[PDB]
Amino acid sequence: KTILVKLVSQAGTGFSFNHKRSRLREKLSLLHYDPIVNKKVLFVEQKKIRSL
Amino acid sequence: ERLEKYRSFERYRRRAEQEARAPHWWRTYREHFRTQKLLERKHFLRELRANVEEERAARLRTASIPLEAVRAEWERTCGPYHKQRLAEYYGLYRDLFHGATFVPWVPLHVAYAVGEEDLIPVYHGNEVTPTEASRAPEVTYEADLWTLLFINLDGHLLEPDAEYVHWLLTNIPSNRVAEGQETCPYLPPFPARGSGFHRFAFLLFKQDKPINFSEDTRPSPCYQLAQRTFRTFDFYKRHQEAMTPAGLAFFQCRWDDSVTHTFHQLLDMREPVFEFVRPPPYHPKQKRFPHEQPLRYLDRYRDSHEPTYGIY
Amino acid sequence: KHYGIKKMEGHYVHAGNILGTQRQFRWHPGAHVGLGRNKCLYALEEGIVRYTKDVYVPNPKNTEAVDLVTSLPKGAVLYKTFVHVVPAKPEGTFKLVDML
Amino acid sequence: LQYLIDLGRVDPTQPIDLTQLVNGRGVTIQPLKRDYGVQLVEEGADTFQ
Amino acid sequence: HLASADWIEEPVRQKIALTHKNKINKAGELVLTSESSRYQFRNLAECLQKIRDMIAEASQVPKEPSKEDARLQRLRIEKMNRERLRQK
Amino acid sequence: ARRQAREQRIAECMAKMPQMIENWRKQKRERWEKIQADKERRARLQAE
Amino acid sequence: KENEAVAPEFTNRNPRNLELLGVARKERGWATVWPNREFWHRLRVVKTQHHVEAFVEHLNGQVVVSASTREWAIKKHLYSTRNVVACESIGRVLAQRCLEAGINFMVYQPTPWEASSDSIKRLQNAMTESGVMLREPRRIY
Amino acid sequence: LTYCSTRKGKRKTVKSVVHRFLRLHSGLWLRRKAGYKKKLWKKSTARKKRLREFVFCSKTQSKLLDKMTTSFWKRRNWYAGDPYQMYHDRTNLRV
RNA sequence: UCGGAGACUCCGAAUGAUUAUAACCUAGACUUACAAGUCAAAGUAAAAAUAUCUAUUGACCCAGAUA
Ligand SMILES: [Mg+2]
Ligand SMILES: [Mg+2]
Ligand SMILES: [Mg+2]
C-alpha cells in the first residue's frame, strides 16, 4: 500500500503540498514551486497523512 | 508487395510534398486557404575539373567563392525572374497597375546618399529610414528617352487607393538625368506614426518619344498633398502607347524622427498618430441568470469600472 | 460519451468553440485548431469550419509512425481527415488616435 | 447635496449635520438597521460649486 | 508652453523636450491628456502627475538601464541588419 | 515584529537554499550513475 | 487645411506590413502533423542527387527568394555542385538575397538526421554569421 | 417552511440558506462548489481551480431561495468598503 | 455504483507503477434535471511548453489536524 505524506517547503515558508509515495520507498524529496517565495525550492517529507 | 517500400523518410516526404501540390478531386487545404552559350559553360566546367587547387579545396572543404561576381551575373540572367517574384510577393504589380504585371528587364540601381563617404543601396524591399532619405538618392542606370519616379503605394492618408510621389523625372535622355525636366520636386518620405511599414517603390519607364507632360508638372516646391496625389495606373494609361515599364526598385520605410520635421515645417499640417485597434472581444448576449458562471461574469459586461450610486 | 461532430460545415465558430470530441483520432487537428489532452478539438480563431483530407506526414522522432510510413510501398500515399477553421475576421485595423 | 442646496431644503450658511440632513429629508436614516451615519461620495464633484 | 515655462528649470526643459519630443506640439507646448474616469478631478490628477514624473525622471539620472524587452531586442537586430546591408 | 520574524526567517533559509538544491541534485545523479554502472556494463563484462 | 484632412480609418495595403509589425497570423494548429506550420516564412533546403538548393517560402508556399546551385552564375564560380562548402556557399548567397530582399527572420525545422548533417550545420552557421535568424518571434496580441 | 408562525404570525427564514448562499440585490444568488474541500489529493489541478470559484444560481434555484428567505434578506445594505459593492446591479443588459 | 467490449453476454474499479514535479489567473465552449464531471487561447509566473499510461467516482453535516 502507498502512504500519503506531507512535503514541506524547506525555504522556511509554511507552504506544504501532499503527495503519494510507496511505503517501501525512502522519504520523497521533490523540487517544487513555492508561491510565497516565487522561486523553486526543495520540499521534504514531514508527516504521514494516511495510508492509501 | 512487388512495389518497393520507402527505406528513408526523405523520399516519402518528397512524394508527400509532391502530392500536396498535385490537384485532387476531394477538397484539400490549398483550395480552401543560347546553344553556343551552353557550350561555353561546358568548357568552363571542364577547366574547373582540371584545376588541382579546386579539387584540393573541395577535399579540404576550404573552398571560397566571390559572392559579388555571382551577384552581378545573377542579375544579368535570371535577376529579372527573381526580381519579378519579389515585386509579385509585395503586390506592387496589382496595386500600381490595377492587376497588370510587367517583368523587369532593365536593372534599376538606386542608392540613397548618406553624407559623402557612402550611399546606402536601395535593395528591393529593404528597410530604409526616412532620416537617411533626407538627401535625394543618386540614380545610376544604363540607357540610350526614359522616365523614373518614386511612388508611395500605401503612404496616402485621405484616400486609400491614392498615392504620393516624391518626385517624377520625365524625358530623361540616356543615362544622364539632369537634362530631363523634373516635373515634381523631391520631398522627404513622411510615413505617419502608427501606420506600420510603408512600401515605397521606384518605377522606370522606357519612353519611345518625347511627350507633353503639362499635367505632370507641379509647382516647385509643391506642398499640396491633394495636388501631389495622382493615380499611377491612370498616368500609365495616358502614355501607355509610348511608355512601357522596364525597371522596378522598392524599399521599406517606417516612422522616424525626421518625419516630425517634415509634417510641420513645409507640409504645414499636424502630424497624424495612428493606433492599432483589434476587434473587440465577443461574449454571448448577457443573460438575466448567469447559471454556472463565476462571479466575474458581470464584470465582462460592465463598461465603467467606477462605482455609481444613482439616486442616493 | 456523446462523441460527435458538434460543429458541422458552414457553421460560424468562435475562438473557444469545441469542434468535436473523439475517443480516438478519427478527425485530426487542422489549421488554427488546437488539440486537447483528452483529444478533443477546439478552435483558435473565429472562422468557418471546413473538412478536408490531406497527406499525413508524421514527426521523425516517434518510432512507430516512422516505421509504418516506411512500410508503405513507394507508390502508395496515405491520407487523413482534418478539421480546419478559416479565419473570418481581420486581426486588427488602423485608426487615427490623435492629430498632434 | 447640490440639488438639496439649490431648492432651499438645506441652509448652506448654517453648519450642516445629520440633524439638518434628515430635517430637510435629504437623507433617510434607520438606526435600528445598523446605520452609523452618512458617507459622502465622489459622484457629482464636478457640478459641486 | 515649454518656452514660457519659466517655472521649469531651463536645463531640464531641454532634456525633457527631446526625450518626449513626440508629446511636444508643433507650437512647442507640451500636450498631455488622460481619459480614464468620469471625474475631471481624477483625470486632471493624471495630467499633473505625469508632469512631475517627467521632471523627476529628467532631473534624476537612471544610471542602470539593465536589460531590454523583446520589442527593443527585435529593433536592435533590425538596425544591425541594416548596417551590414549598406556595404556600398 | 511577527512580520520581521517571518521575513528574516525566509531570507536565512533562502541564503542556504542553493547549496541544498545542489546536494539534492547530486544525490539524484549519484543514484542514477550507479544504476547503469552494472545495469549493462556489468552484463557486458560478464559476456566478455 | 486641405492637407490636414485625413480619413479616420487607415488602410495599409502592404501584405508584409502586419508581419513586420508582428501581429500577423500564424497557423497554430497541426498538432499531430510535422513539420509545424507556426512560421511566417520557412527556409527549406533540398539536397538532390547532384544539386543542393535552398528556398524561402511564405505560408502560401510561394518562394519569395530562391538560391540554387543549378543557376549558371553560381555553378560557374562553384567547383562541385554538391559539396559541404557548396552548402556553405549557397547559404551565404541566399542570405545576401534575403538581406537585400528585407526578410531577416525565418523558421527552419530540419529533421533529426538533417540537423545532424554537418553541411546543414555549416549552412546554418552561414545564416547566423550573415545575420539571418532561424527563430522568428512569437506573435503579439 | 413556516408560512404563519404562532407567536408573530409571519413567515420564517430557513437558516440553511442564510449559511450557504449570498443574494445580490438584483436577484442573483452566489454559492460555492460542493466538495471544494474534499479529497483534494486525488483531484486534478484544473478540477481544483473550478471548485474554488463562486457560482451563480438558476432561475428555479433563485426562485426557490426567494421563497425560503424573508424580505429582510432582500434589502439594500450600505456597507462601507464592501467587496461586493459593484455586483449588486446589472448593467448593459437588454432582455 | 462506475467504466471497457459484444449484441442482453463477458472484463475490470474503488486505481497502482513511472514519475528531476506540472503555478496562478482568465476569453469561449462540451456535458447535464439538479449536483458532479470535461477541454482551453490570452495574460502572468517558475524554470531551460504537457507527469506517465491503462480507467475510475462518495455530497452536506460533523469530527480531526497545522501556522
Ligand atoms: Mg435607509
Ligand atoms: Mg451542475
Ligand atoms: Mg495562454
Give the CA C23 to C1' I5 distance in Å: 14
How far away, in angstroms, is D22 Cα from ligand 1 center? Answer: 11
Nearest of B220, B216, B198, B199 to residue B207 by alpha carbon: B216
Give CA–CA dist H71/B179, Å, rounded.
Answer: 95
Chain A residue whose CA is closest to F14? A11
Method: cryo-EM
Helix axes B79-89, B67-77, angle to 10 degrees: 80
> Which residue among C31, C95, C96 sits closest to G30, beta carbon to beta carbon?
C31
Task: Name the residue type at position H11.
Answer: R
Q: Which 53-92 positions of H have CB less than 7 A from strand I?
A: 55, 57-58, 61
Phi-psi region of B156 (alpha: psi -120 to 50; beta: other; left: phi over 0): beta
Q: Do B276 and C94 touch (CB under 8 A)?
A: yes
Resolution, angstroms, 1 dp: 3.6
Which residues contact residue G126 at a Cβ distance below 8 angstroms, ignoring those fewer than 6 apart?
Answer: G88, G91, G92, G95
How far away, in angstroms, is B280 Cα from ligand 3 center? Answer: 18
- Counting ligands in written order, the one closest to the CA of B292 is 2
> Which residue among F9, F12, F21 sits closest to A42, beta carbon to beta carbon?
F21
**Secondary structure of chain B as H, E, C letters:** CCCCECCCHHHHHHHHHHHHHCCCCCCCHHHHCCHHHHHHHHHHHHHHHHCHHHHHHHHCCCCCCCHHHHHHHHHHHCHHHHHHHHHHHCCHHHHHHCCCCCCCCCCCEEEEEECCCEEEECCCCEECCCCHHHCCCEEECCCCCEEEEEEECCCCCCCCCCEEEEEEEEEECCCCCCCCCEEECCCCCCCCECCCCEEEEEEEEEECCCCCCCCCCCCCCCCCHHHHCECHHHHHHHHCCCEEEEEEEEEEECCCHHHHHHHHHCCCCCCEEEEEECCCCCCCCCCCCCCCCECCHHHHCCCCCCCCCCCC
Helix axes C63-71, B9-21, angle to 10 degrees: 70
CA distance to D21, D27, E30, F12, per residue, from D18 (Å):
5, 9, 47, 55
Cβ–Cβ < 8 Å for B87, G13: no
Exposure of G84 in the CB half-sphere (CA atoms within 13 A): 12
Task: Say if F and B touch: at least 3 Cβ pairs within 8 Å.
Answer: no
Q: Do G3 and B269 touch (CB under 8 A)?
A: yes
Cβ–Cβ < 8 Å for B38, C99: no
Q: Which residues of F touch A36 (CB under 8 A)?
A: 10
E4 phi and psi angles, rounded to 5 deg: -85, 0
In angstroms, what separates the C-alpha of D43 from chain H's closest C-alpha? 15
Task: Say if A and H touch: at least 3 Cβ pairs within 8 Å.
Answer: yes
Give the CA C29 to C1' I58 distance in Å: 37
C52 phi and psi angles, rounded to 5 deg: -140, 160
Give CA–CA dist G137/G139, Å, rounded.
Answer: 6
How far away, in angstroms, is B310 Cα from ligand 1 center? Answer: 15
How far away, in angstroms, is D29 Cα from ligand 1 center? Answer: 5
Strand I contact nucleotides, protein CB < 7 Å: 4-5, 15-32, 34-43, 45-47, 50, 57-60, 64, 66-67
Q: Do E85 and G133 touch (CB under 8 A)?
A: no
Cβ–Cβ < 8 Å for C17, C41: no
What are the b/e assignments for F8-41, b being 16+ CB within 10 Å? eebeebbeebeebeeebeeeeeeeeeeeeeeeee
Give CA–CA dist B49/C47, Å, rounded.
Answer: 58
The SS3 of residue C76 is coil
B302 beta carbon to strand I: under 7 Å: no
CA distance to B119, B133, B179, per residue, from B128 (Å):
12, 7, 28
Nearest 10 degrees: Cα torsion C71, C75, C76, C81:
120
A26 beta carbon to strand I: under 7 Å: no
Which residues contact residue H32 at a Cβ distance below 8 angstroms, ignoring those fewer than 6 apart?
Answer: H20, H54, H55
Give the CA A25 to C1' I17 distance in Å: 13
For Cα atoms C45, C50, C52, give the angle at the middle one, nearest 5 degrees.
Answer: 125
